[PDB]
């Protein structure tokens, strides 16, 4: 993503298609190095982009409240509670084993 | 007195927008992208990209940027 | 959820709502202690106990036995004397009263004592609502002005004869009901000389140990709501024992 | 084996950034802004079967 030195406006968001206002949106603020992924259409599929832009989490905590009202439904979420169920879920020794 | 219960936390949807179409075609007169009402109002010269006052009309804006481009070295 | 939408208390909390609970109880022991019935009733069971019909541990839960003995006779002395003082009857039933708050009796009196009140106090309000219904429900007559002839007199034929009389076309059509009127009257006369007292007072008891017993529930109410998490900790130990862990949290909530 | 979630969910509860997410999972080619601006590095084992 690309904010602005004047305002410090973002001028564009990562994960997001460029086009010709954009381009010209971001150039004429003053950047010079500008990179994009490289994807085809039968050898490097943009699945994790498609899977992101379906994603209507924002962040960790979004994450973790989400993961925690699908795991125990109609139970008011808590950042201490869910925190400790997504470290128990996997990264506990004593609830998984990976002999 | 009493004490403080523990806060819950919420979140929004990240509500992603929608990609432009920028339906667009070069038959010949190198001046006729379409995006909207004047379609085009496109000039870049240097190291910058530099925005038109775009102009409604295709042939003010295409003989504007010719002029530009001629006395902008 | 509905358990957690609570918050506990603190110890500053708890000494302000058992303080609380102590002035409601303070403040339905003095209404209660105001009524003469409540000594006639510990008069007339003192009586049972000492004619071989009970027993001495269910007449007072200790104090706040020749002592006890003299005192009941010093009450006995200070209800005759105030039977037989009736401008210094209001002074000497407050003498009493505070008497009667010096003994600790037993929680089953103090009940029989309140549902008693409770009982003469729907009787009046029975026929309260009987003497409203016969003439307001009845004659149709005006609720301002049955308002302001039945405010404080509620004995005399004040809602009587001016319903009737008053030159209306609807007034003078229910002398058949006037019987009724009257029965309803000498009914109340009944009552209050059962009760020696007035009627405004009793209602006014009634309504203030009414405003008591609502703040004590809403002080309990507010303490279980506290200790609910207490309660359900407590429970948490006995889920493998045949019981089901709600039913278990429900004994943990009515202990 | 419960309801199903998007995979991007689990990745970013793992204090992991949109940004980051693509670098990871994706190859990153600069393109510059030379005179004509369009002068993008070209690795030539990019142009095969499309």
Known sequence: ?99 | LRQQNRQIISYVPRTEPAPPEHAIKMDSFRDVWMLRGKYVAFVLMGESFLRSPAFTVPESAQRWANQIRQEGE | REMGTVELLTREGEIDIAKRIEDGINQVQCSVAEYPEAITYLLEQYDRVEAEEARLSDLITGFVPELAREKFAELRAQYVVTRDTIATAQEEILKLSEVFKQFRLVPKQFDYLVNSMRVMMDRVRTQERLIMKLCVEQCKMPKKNFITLFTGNETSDTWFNAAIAMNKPWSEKLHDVSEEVHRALQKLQQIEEETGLTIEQVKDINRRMSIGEAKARRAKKEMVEANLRLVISIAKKYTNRGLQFLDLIQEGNIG | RRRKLPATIILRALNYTTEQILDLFFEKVIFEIRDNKLQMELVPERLRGE
Request: hydrophobic share 35%; glycine share 4%; aromatic share 8%.
């Open chain 1, 1 to 99: 993503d690309y904010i602005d030195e004047s305002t410090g406006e973002l001028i564009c968001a990562a994960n997001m298609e460029l086009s010709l206002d954009l381009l010209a949106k971001l150039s004429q603020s003053g950047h010079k190095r500008i990179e994009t992924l490289f994807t085809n259409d039968l050898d490097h599929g943009p699945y994790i982009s498609e899977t992101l832009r379906v994603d209507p989490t924002n962040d960790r905590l979004s994450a973790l409240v989400e993961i925690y009202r699908m795991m125990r439904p109609g139970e008011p979420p808590t950042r201490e509670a869910a925190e400790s169920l997504f470290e128990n879920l996997f990264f506990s020794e004593d609830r998984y084993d990976l002999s």
